[PDB]
Design a protein around this ligand. Sequence first.
Ligand SMILES: Cc1nc2ccc(NC(=O)CCNC(N)=O)cc2s1
Ligand SMILES: Cc1nc2ccc(NC(=O)CCNC(N)=O)cc2s1
Ligand SMILES: Cc1nc2ccc(NC(=O)CCNC(N)=O)cc2s1
Ligand SMILES: Cc1nc2ccc(NC(=O)CCNC(N)=O)cc2s1
Ligand SMILES: COc1ccc(CC(C(=O)O)C(=O)O)cc1OC
Ligand SMILES: COc1ccc(CC(C(=O)O)C(=O)O)cc1OC
Lengths: 330, 330, 330, 330
Amino acid sequence: ALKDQLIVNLLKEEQVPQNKITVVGVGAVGMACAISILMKDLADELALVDVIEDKLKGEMMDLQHGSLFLKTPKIVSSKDYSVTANSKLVIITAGARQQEGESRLNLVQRNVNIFKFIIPNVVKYSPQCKLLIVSNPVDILTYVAWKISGFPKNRVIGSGCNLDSARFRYLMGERLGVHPLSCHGWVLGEHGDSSVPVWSGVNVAGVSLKSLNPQLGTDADKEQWKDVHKQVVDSAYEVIKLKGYTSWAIGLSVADLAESIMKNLRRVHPISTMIKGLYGIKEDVFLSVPCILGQNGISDVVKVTLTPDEEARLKKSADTLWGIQKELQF
Amino acid sequence: ALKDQLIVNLLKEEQVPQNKITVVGVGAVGMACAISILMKDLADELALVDVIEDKLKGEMMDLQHGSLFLKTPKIVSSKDYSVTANSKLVIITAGARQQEGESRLNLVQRNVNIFKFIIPNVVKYSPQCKLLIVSNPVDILTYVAWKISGFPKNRVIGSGCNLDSARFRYLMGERLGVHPLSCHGWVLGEHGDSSVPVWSGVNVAGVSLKSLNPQLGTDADKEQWKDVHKQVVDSAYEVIKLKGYTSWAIGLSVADLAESIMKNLRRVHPISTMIKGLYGIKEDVFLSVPCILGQNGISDVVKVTLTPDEEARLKKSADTLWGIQKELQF
Amino acid sequence: ALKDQLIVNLLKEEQVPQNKITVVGVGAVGMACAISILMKDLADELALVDVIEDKLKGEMMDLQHGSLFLKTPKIVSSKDYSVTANSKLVIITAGARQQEGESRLNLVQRNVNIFKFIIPNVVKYSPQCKLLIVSNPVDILTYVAWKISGFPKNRVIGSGCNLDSARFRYLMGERLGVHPLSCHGWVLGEHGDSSVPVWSGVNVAGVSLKSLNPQLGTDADKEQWKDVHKQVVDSAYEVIKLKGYTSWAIGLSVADLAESIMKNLRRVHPISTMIKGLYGIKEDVFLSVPCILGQNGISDVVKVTLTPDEEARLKKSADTLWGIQKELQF
Amino acid sequence: ALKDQLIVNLLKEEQVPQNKITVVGVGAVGMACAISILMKDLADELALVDVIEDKLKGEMMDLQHGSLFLKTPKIVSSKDYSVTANSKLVIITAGARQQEGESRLNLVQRNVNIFKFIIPNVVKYSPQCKLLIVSNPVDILTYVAWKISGFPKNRVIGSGCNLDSARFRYLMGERLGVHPLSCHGWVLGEHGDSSVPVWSGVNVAGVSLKSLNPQLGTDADKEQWKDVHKQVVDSAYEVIKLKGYTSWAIGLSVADLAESIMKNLRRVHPISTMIKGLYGIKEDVFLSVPCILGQNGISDVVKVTLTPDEEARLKKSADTLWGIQKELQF
Ligand SMILES: Cc1nc2ccc(NC(=O)CCNC(N)=O)cc2s1
Ligand SMILES: Cc1nc2ccc(NC(=O)CCNC(N)=O)cc2s1
Ligand SMILES: Cc1nc2ccc(NC(=O)CCNC(N)=O)cc2s1
Ligand SMILES: Cc1nc2ccc(NC(=O)CCNC(N)=O)cc2s1
Ligand SMILES: COc1ccc(CC(C(=O)O)C(=O)O)cc1OC
Ligand SMILES: COc1ccc(CC(C(=O)O)C(=O)O)cc1OC
């Protein structure tokens, strides 16, 4: 053979991936996560899983054909979860998505039923994995993945408000003529209608915008900064109305979280975690709060000092999510 | 105003972008080019153009929402070509796309008609840009763009065989257990069925594979390496059959060419250029040959020493393209 | 020639760089700036300038030999400023550096005299550049370069407190077990002994550390956070005492600023600019305040809301700089 | 405590890094390797070791101060090898370095003696690491590290001719007006005076320069291409004469090898390995040949088809190295 004429093999050794990532679901979101992760050089192996065989193989081959321009030497796919073996991170993007005028909370029964199959199959082959939930309603589905997997809470993360906060900062950036990287602001709670803009923490270079305009974020605000939070809430629906779905922003948001996990960065992100014991919440509610994210998932939670109005809005978001959690049939 | 309370403006300057890129066409190819360029930090401004207003706005908004995770501070879109002003590079991905079980040659007249509208509009707003043609059949459309624009040939580039060669190197790499970056081989001529694998230049670490297998790539090859080029030819048809279209690998190939142009790298790429005068070709035929690509587009061509077999196949590829091209009225 | 047998030239080589950067001074700082800029792919051309012939050629050759691993196709050097023609950014690192126990303020006479030769020569060849002053005392030298250059104040930037703030954020991060990217804190005023830690703006996820611990940064603080600012002030002295000079951190801080300039990011950095008109300062003092930094240099200044002690400390830093600056002759 | 008022801790992590790199030696080479690895985001932990206490601490602090600008969350140092525990890759740059006009072979006993202390201490703390030898004479010291470590040969790698080949490609690129990435050429054997330029494999786009010029690299060559190899051999001596040492190019060359190892790329590099069984070599000689480099180090060797003259020159390089190698006291 030409291979043996050209190359002398010196080592037999069984190859075990060291920084493997799995993406479950090859819809627009799953593929946006995959291309973003590949272009950020976060993985030494990428596995794709779906139930539609042709689409799955087609997507895998299309990524494989770009290998010369990448630094991820193995891209694989299968409907069989054995392909995901030894993942450090498993990203779940499978399930139904909301129609215009439909709440993400309406996807709950359909997506729980799918998670009942996916979750046990994913965890089986990857003892060192963190579970990163993207599927909606993300907060509820992070709780569901946590309950089905039996994993400790640090290992089950929802993409949550990482995207809502990126959108908030983009919009704040546009109003101020500043890059979103230098515009600070947190959108917490449900990744959905009940999200909470933390006006008290909105700042540029440590300068609180609320301290310059005490009415910031209220109906009495002359500049109507509340409209920025409304644009954040409505963003998925606006994009869905225009292009049919959303993909790029969520893909970049998920790759941002994959980077903190894979590189053990210990950066702070507003992502879905269990909040029992904070802000008077006595139940096993998952929602976004600022979390320290690294190689073991969420190791620490930042205790945000909220005003009584912000805390009441966060509790209202938690009560909404808890109500849906009470509807779950395991 | 809150902005004026927070920030002292010292310079009111709109200012022209210095490294602007425009992508014409927001289909799967155009958006894969867009995301790949964004993730490679090649531009300070990205402009998107299309005729479907809602689709265009939603795509632009979806990219804008990931701004926090990027280093391209301005993303704009319009059906109006005024949005493309001062582009250094304009990438054309618009038109009818290759269909299941159909040649790229079947899209020719429809895409020539679309180019009669696009090209003068691009030229009006960026008369000094480099045009990068991606739309199929790419070799013919690069010639078409060249004739319509009135630009010198160096500034009209076709993505051509940059992807066919990347596919070839991926497949060669899989066979040898070597990264495609270390597997060298060139696929020239038409970006399509009549492409030419240059078996005489196929090598690893300067070791000619043909020196180890004299029959390499011929019918008489005991290992049938011609099947690797057959896989290269068939790739888009297989991917289209499986997922409906191709996008990821072409987006990466296009970003690879955008990088050499924007960064004046002078790397060698197999891309579409006028081959009149080489290998006995006497007509204004465009096809892929290895070109030096930089800030002024194609400045030089590498003269590959083709074997009589390879030269015959390249002449045949040129004949197939000219045949279609001569019966073109514009 | 072999070149003409291999390559057919199709275009006359009138090469003019599009993103050229010049580094003046090839001491440890200049070279750390050069390597960091090369590794961030910020330039299509890198020019080096110094007065020591051998050292300059050796440094240029050593960078050139790494070209295969870089995306900066042209690296040049000369004592002659003609080599710096058409730069978009010129970084000044030339001049005397402080000994152990010597203030940066003591370098002023030597460095002003050097700037009288360097500054007109830089502007003569790069009329479109932004000037990035690194040489010490940076704040006074930014004012000096501005007066000599004839450039508008937005185009004359001092690296200032971009490094002091990065040191502050690293130390804060270490104490909290959070990445410095998520630890916000500003050190303003002189890049030297009179720098001001803005305790009121110190936060993680918008949570003010001063609101949690009112004693923060005072002598009554049980955790002695004032020692963090003391370590910031003493950093250069401590590192000089240990390794003889500093290079890596300043190199990275300068590359960070070069990135915001070259990519027009409009990120906020604490850098040297004219502060006359703010905090009751009436003289042409330059010092660090948070600035919006982009393609036209400093376009805007953020008005930080300082506590009475922080403001008095900032005014005192301005007085210190003015006491040295008022006695200058150039 | 402030940390506790701000953050709720969820778990006590293992804190064992997953992509740890150690650099032994904080001289100019060691630090250039350190900065290049840090800027390529290859590690989650970087450890530095040296015998000069002050210089070690100063260097570690200077890197730490740039953390905000990096993605390597932990940078540590100590004279004690306990700091190197669980490294995937250990890079040895320690020992005597060449003075002006000094042969690398002259450093042999001083470096073998130093390696007698270093190697057992590295093996004790990371028994599963890959060893990457940079210290000179690199080929002999890779043999020394292999014998002392007791490691299998795949895990003991010398930087060898990776830099010599990069210099060759830079020089070839400058002559042709092509980026070194598109210029292919291999320098094998000793990383020193007896290195071998493989003229038969020198090409651009698979076009052999020797096929165009049959006298390429000989005394009869009109363009004197042999001078390119002479420039390669003389490079380190020329740079040492000018700046006192070399650092940048070797640092980039080392980070390139580190990248193939850490990311399991399986790229081909000309690096030091055991060549027993090839080209008539019957002894445990280490020298540069093209190697497939990945997560398990050197898994395979490419068999280069050398001409009788090229093979005699390689056997000459082998004989020269073995002469010293066979009589080592350790
Ligand atoms: C039992 C099941 N396992 C899977 C695995 C993947 C998918 N794939 C998607 O749902 C992709 C399309 N959806 C979005 N939102 O992109 C569905 C199922 S059903
Ligand atoms: C006169 C015309 N101007 C344009 C501009 C853009 C597009 N857009 C596409 O064709 C995108 C979808 N097609 C592929 N190939 O992705 C069509 C036209 S028609
Ligand atoms: C009229 C003059 N033009 C120059 C240009 C460069 C340098 N070079 C340095 O000073 C580098 C070493 N200094 C530090 N601080 O790194 C000195 C002079 S004097
Ligand atoms: C027993 C010993 N262990 C070590 C460890 C590190 C170093 N450090 C250097 O040699 C750095 C300076 N030299 C070059 N080549 O950069 C020397 C020794 S001696
Ligand atoms: C699994 O499907 C999705 C998950 C999240 C998003 C992100 C989206 C949303 O939450 O609806 C958004 O906010 O843009 C979109 C998805 O399908 C298109
Ligand atoms: C031009 O010389 C320098 C400019 C800035 C620094 C940065 C340094 C300082 O300001 O002394 C620091 O803070 O590390 C160091 C220099 O030479 C060693």
